[PDB]
Write an enzyme that holds these catalytic residues in place. Structure first.
Site, PDB file in Angstrom:
ATOM      1  N   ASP A  49      26.960  63.618  74.930  1.00  0.00           N
ATOM      2  CA  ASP A  49      26.479  62.083  74.399  1.00  0.00           C
ATOM      3  C   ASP A  49      25.496  62.229  73.723  1.00  0.00           C
ATOM      4  OD1 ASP A  49      26.250  59.405  74.341  1.00  0.00           O
ATOM      5  OD2 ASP A  49      26.288  58.885  76.177  1.00  0.00           O
ATOM      6  N   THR A  50      25.523  61.979  72.407  1.00  0.00           N
ATOM      7  CA  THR A  50      24.492  61.929  71.242  1.00  0.00           C
ATOM      8  C   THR A  50      23.447  60.768  71.525  1.00  0.00           C
ATOM      9  OG1 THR A  50      25.609  61.514  69.497  1.00  0.00           O
ATOM     10  CG2 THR A  50      25.149  63.668  69.637  1.00  0.00           C
ATOM     11  N   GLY A  51      24.071  59.724  72.025  1.00  0.00           N
ATOM     12  CA  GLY A  51      23.796  58.389  72.150  1.00  0.00           C
ATOM     13  C   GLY A  51      22.648  58.213  73.416  1.00  0.00           C
TER      14      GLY A  51
HETATM   15  C1  LIG Z   1      28.079  51.810  73.206  1.00  0.00           C
HETATM   16  C2  LIG Z   1      29.071  51.392  74.065  1.00  0.00           C
HETATM   17  C3  LIG Z   1      30.329  50.907  73.315  1.00  0.00           C
HETATM   18  C4  LIG Z   1      29.886  52.447  75.301  1.00  0.00           C
HETATM   19  N1  LIG Z   1      30.799  52.083  76.050  1.00  0.00           N
HETATM   20  C5  LIG Z   1      31.789  52.269  75.856  1.00  0.00           C
HETATM   21  O1  LIG Z   1      32.232  53.206  75.160  1.00  0.00           O
HETATM   22  C6  LIG Z   1      32.906  51.770  76.767  1.00  0.00           C
HETATM   23  C7  LIG Z   1      33.817  52.881  77.657  1.00  0.00           C
HETATM   24  N2  LIG Z   1      34.043  51.149  76.067  1.00  0.00           N
HETATM   25  C8  LIG Z   1      34.614  50.098  76.185  1.00  0.00           C
HETATM   26  O2  LIG Z   1      34.452  49.097  77.233  1.00  0.00           O
HETATM   27  O3  LIG Z   1      36.056  50.015  76.022  1.00  0.00           O
HETATM   28  C9  LIG Z   1      37.033  48.917  76.307  1.00  0.00           C
HETATM   29  C10 LIG Z   1      37.458  48.822  77.897  1.00  0.00           C
HETATM   30  C11 LIG Z   1      37.868  47.519  78.349  1.00  0.00           C
HETATM   31  C12 LIG Z   1      38.231  47.423  79.562  1.00  0.00           C
HETATM   32  C13 LIG Z   1      37.903  48.526  80.579  1.00  0.00           C
HETATM   33  C14 LIG Z   1      37.196  49.651  79.953  1.00  0.00           C
HETATM   34  C15 LIG Z   1      37.020  49.626  78.561  1.00  0.00           C
HETATM   35  C16 LIG Z   1      28.451  52.962  76.020  1.00  0.00           C
HETATM   36  O4  LIG Z   1      27.744  52.022  76.660  1.00  0.00           O
HETATM   37  N3  LIG Z   1      28.196  54.155  76.409  1.00  0.00           N
HETATM   38  C17 LIG Z   1      27.234  54.830  77.188  1.00  0.00           C
HETATM   39  C18 LIG Z   1      27.664  55.430  78.358  1.00  0.00           C
HETATM   40  C19 LIG Z   1      28.672  54.882  79.070  1.00  0.00           C
HETATM   41  C20 LIG Z   1      30.059  54.409  78.942  1.00  0.00           C
HETATM   42  C21 LIG Z   1      30.613  53.819  79.855  1.00  0.00           C
HETATM   43  C22 LIG Z   1      30.148  53.385  81.176  1.00  0.00           C
HETATM   44  C23 LIG Z   1      28.800  53.586  81.303  1.00  0.00           C
HETATM   45  C24 LIG Z   1      28.049  54.265  80.317  1.00  0.00           C
HETATM   46  C25 LIG Z   1      26.557  55.806  76.397  1.00  0.00           C
HETATM   47  O5  LIG Z   1      27.441  56.820  76.045  1.00  0.00           O
HETATM   48  C26 LIG Z   1      26.093  55.266  74.884  1.00  0.00           C
HETATM   49  O6  LIG Z   1      25.756  56.261  74.148  1.00  0.00           O
HETATM   50  C27 LIG Z   1      24.610  54.357  74.952  1.00  0.00           C
HETATM   51  C28 LIG Z   1      24.479  53.735  73.567  1.00  0.00           C
HETATM   52  C29 LIG Z   1      23.274  53.107  73.573  1.00  0.00           C
HETATM   53  C30 LIG Z   1      22.138  53.390  73.230  1.00  0.00           C
HETATM   54  C31 LIG Z   1      20.799  52.673  73.231  1.00  0.00           C
HETATM   55  C32 LIG Z   1      20.938  51.541  73.519  1.00  0.00           C
HETATM   56  C33 LIG Z   1      22.059  50.885  74.324  1.00  0.00           C
HETATM   57  C34 LIG Z   1      23.273  51.560  74.135  1.00  0.00           C
HETATM   58  N4  LIG Z   1      23.582  54.962  75.663  1.00  0.00           N
HETATM   59  C35 LIG Z   1      23.033  54.654  76.663  1.00  0.00           C
HETATM   60  O7  LIG Z   1      23.333  53.574  77.425  1.00  0.00           O
HETATM   61  C36 LIG Z   1      22.046  55.589  76.947  1.00  0.00           C
HETATM   62  N5  LIG Z   1      20.728  54.798  77.203  1.00  0.00           N
HETATM   63  C37 LIG Z   1      19.806  55.503  76.750  1.00  0.00           C
HETATM   64  O8  LIG Z   1      19.666  56.736  76.125  1.00  0.00           O
HETATM   65  C38 LIG Z   1      18.381  54.647  76.663  1.00  0.00           C
HETATM   66  C39 LIG Z   1      18.286  53.941  75.125  1.00  0.00           C
HETATM   67  N6  LIG Z   1      17.111  55.176  76.802  1.00  0.00           N
HETATM   68  C40 LIG Z   1      16.631  54.546  77.939  1.00  0.00           C
HETATM   69  O9  LIG Z   1      17.068  54.097  78.832  1.00  0.00           O
HETATM   70  O10 LIG Z   1      15.109  55.126  78.322  1.00  0.00           O
HETATM   71  C41 LIG Z   1      14.312  54.511  79.197  1.00  0.00           C
HETATM   72  C42 LIG Z   1      13.877  53.282  78.956  1.00  0.00           C
HETATM   73  C43 LIG Z   1      13.233  52.463  80.014  1.00  0.00           C
HETATM   74  C44 LIG Z   1      12.595  51.264  79.671  1.00  0.00           C
HETATM   75  C45 LIG Z   1      12.814  50.518  78.518  1.00  0.00           C
HETATM   76  C46 LIG Z   1      13.516  51.451  77.473  1.00  0.00           C
HETATM   77  C47 LIG Z   1      13.932  52.757  77.665  1.00  0.00           C
HETATM   78  C48 LIG Z   1      22.310  56.198  78.592  1.00  0.00           C
HETATM   79  C49 LIG Z   1      23.610  56.719  78.810  1.00  0.00           C
HETATM   80  C50 LIG Z   1      21.221  57.175  78.992  1.00  0.00           C
END
Ligand SMILES: CC(C)[C@H](NC(=O)[C@H](C)NC(=O)OCc1ccccc1)C(=O)N[C@@H](Cc1ccccc1)[C@@H](O)[C@H](O)[C@H](Cc1ccccc1)NC(=O)[C@@H](NC(=O)[C@H](C)NC(=O)OCc1ccccc1)C(C)C
Lengths: 99, 99
Positions: free
Chosen positions: B25-27
């Site tokens: 996961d690059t995000g």
């Molecule tokens: C972007 C969304 C469309 C994505 N979701 C999907 O693709 C979902 C499955 N799609 C979907 O919903 O499809 C329709 C559906 C309908 C019904 C049922 C099921 C599905 C998603 O959130 N994907 C995440 C993984 C995931 C997927 C499903 C369930 C749970 C987790 C990461 O891969 C994605 O790459 C995100 C993108 C992102 C980046 C930055 C900000 C917001 C979002 N990164 C993350 O969420 C990562 N966070 C980070 O890297 C953050 C930015 N850093 C961080 O938190 O550092 C500490 C910090 C502390 C305090 C303040 C700030 C930072 C996480 C996995 C480690």
């Protein structure tokens, strides 16, 4: 380009006459952009991630330029803190992961 | 391997004697794994995403095998629906994006 991952993979996108930065995101099924005005009709949609599910607006057949590469696709718009280029568009620009 | 993005980039990981599937996961800044028991001390941490925040447990200097490539790093453990390999570990295995 070949993009290492020491920092966030942010690139320049052009969409709707506007310039934005967006993350190339292999963990996103879809492309999700912050609030902006796009011309056209749309459908409500829900997407999920870490911490839960948000409501977004879905637009089809939207033109996006991602680092000079044109793609046409579905783009979701809603309350995301960062612009996301997801896999639906990454496949169109021939993007691969390599190790 | 060269991995296209027509489907979710899932790979086999081995961690704590156990075999799992995880998304490359690059995000993701960090690596986040579903609930499992890891030996060692840990620190509370919060991470954010789409739809909000979650609390996770942080473990340092954990050995993970990602597709036959060994890496040592910080691994977070908590209520995620999918195992995530984030950039902290992707840099260690030499993973790049290419288009
Ligand atoms: C972007 C969304 C469309 C994505 N979701 C999907 O693709 C979902 C499955 N799609 C979907 O919903 O499809 C329709 C559906 C309908 C019904 C049922 C099921 C599905 C998603 O959130 N994907 C995440 C993984 C995931 C997927 C499903 C369930 C749970 C987790 C990461 O891969 C994605 O790459 C995100 C993108 C992102 C980046 C930055 C900000 C917001 C979002 N990164 C993350 O969420 C990562 N966070 C980070 O890297 C953050 C930015 N850093 C961080 O938190 O550092 C500490 C910090 C502390 C305090 C303040 C700030 C930072 C996480 C996995 C480690």
């Amino acid at each position: 380009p070949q993009i290492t991952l020491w920092k966030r993979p942010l690139v320049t996108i052009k969409i709707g006459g506007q310039l934005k930065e967006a993350l190339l995101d292999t963990g996103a099924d879809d492309t999700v952009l912050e609030e902006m005005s796009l011309p056209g009709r749309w459908k409500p949609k829900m997407i999920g991630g870490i911490g839960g599910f948000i409501k977004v607006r879905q637009y089809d057949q939207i033109l996006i330029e991602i680092c000079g590469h044109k793609a046409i696709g579905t783009v979701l718009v809603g309350p995301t803190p960062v612009n996301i280029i997801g896999r639906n568009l990454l496949t169109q620009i021939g993007c691969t992961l390599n190790f």
